[PDB]
Ligand binder design. Structure first.
Ligand SMILES: COc1cncc(-c2cnc(NC3CCNCC3)c3[nH]c(=O)c(C)cc23)c1
Ligand SMILES: COc1cncc(-c2cnc(NC3CCNCC3)c3[nH]c(=O)c(C)cc23)c1
Lengths: 130, 130
């Protein structure tokens, strides 16, 4: 219905705003675009579902997220990929893991403050009816 | 259930085999890998959901296709993207469009010959129950 289309449009507006705020944070530059294969040649083989903030924006615009829960799955994927690909004790690995956890924590904290629980419940109920 | 897992595993085996047969055809080399942005800088902006045969293989392996119908949507996407991005009368554009239609036609013809309709119906009924 028209009311449901308006609901998903509001969701997309909300998710774009959250994603933009993550993307302009200097700490998260490494997660903003797909990896350069020249910098990490084995990334494609080790990480089976790459994800980054530009890809998240494309998915929002393709109407791939019908709930904030589904969006957070991709944010969690950005984090889990980083922990998987950079598990070593070396400072470079530790920096990226810290930034990955910070990205995750920041996204969840924004959502906790700014997402109305009843709005999310509505989205979930519309999704389950499709 | 175990029987349903076996069904989706058989689907994945079937889809990998079809995709491999498309990927080794010389006509379809242009569709085997993501586009090189150096060759087509405006591709990212014009085509909103890029798709290629290596991406299709990754999606099979990530369990993204529960039916042949969903797989054919991505094959159709490879074709529609090509028709959209190369619409001109020039020979280069006409060649790619012809190959795109041939890819689509070939995938459908393989499926028509080799996919049991009752196998596809089972997949669809399992998908709809989830
Ligand atoms: C423009 O700079 C880059 C572009 N693309 C990828 C990276 C990058 C480089 N190194 C990583 N990890 C190494 C750190 C030192 N120990 C070996 C691994 C990276 N790890 C990542 O998770 C991502 C997303 C990029 C990246 C950088
Ligand atoms: C290694 O060669 C390539 C790598 N990546 C992309 C292409 C490519 C080049 N040109 C295209 N179309 C032009 C043909 C002449 N008129 C202007 C457009 C391409 N079109 C496509 O649809 C794809 C997938 C690649 C491609 C080639």
């Amino acid at each position: 219905s028209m009311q449901e289309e308006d609901t998903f449009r509001e969701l997309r507006i909300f998710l774009r705003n959250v994603t933009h705020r993550l993307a302009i944070d200097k700490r998260f530059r490494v997660f903003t675009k797909p990896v350069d294969p020249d910098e990490v040649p084995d990334y494609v083989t080790v990480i089976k579902q790459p994800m980054d903030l530009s890809s998240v924006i494309s998915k929002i615009d393709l109407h791939k997220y019908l709930t904030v829960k589904d969006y957070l799955r991709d944010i969690d994927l950005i984090c889990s990929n980083a922990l998987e690909y950079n598990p070593d004790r070396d400072p470079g690995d530790r920096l990226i893991r810290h930034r990955a956890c910070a990205l995750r924590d920041t996204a969840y904290a924004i959502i906790k403050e700014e997402l109305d629980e009843d709005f999310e419940q509505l989205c979930e109920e519309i999704q389950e009816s499709r």
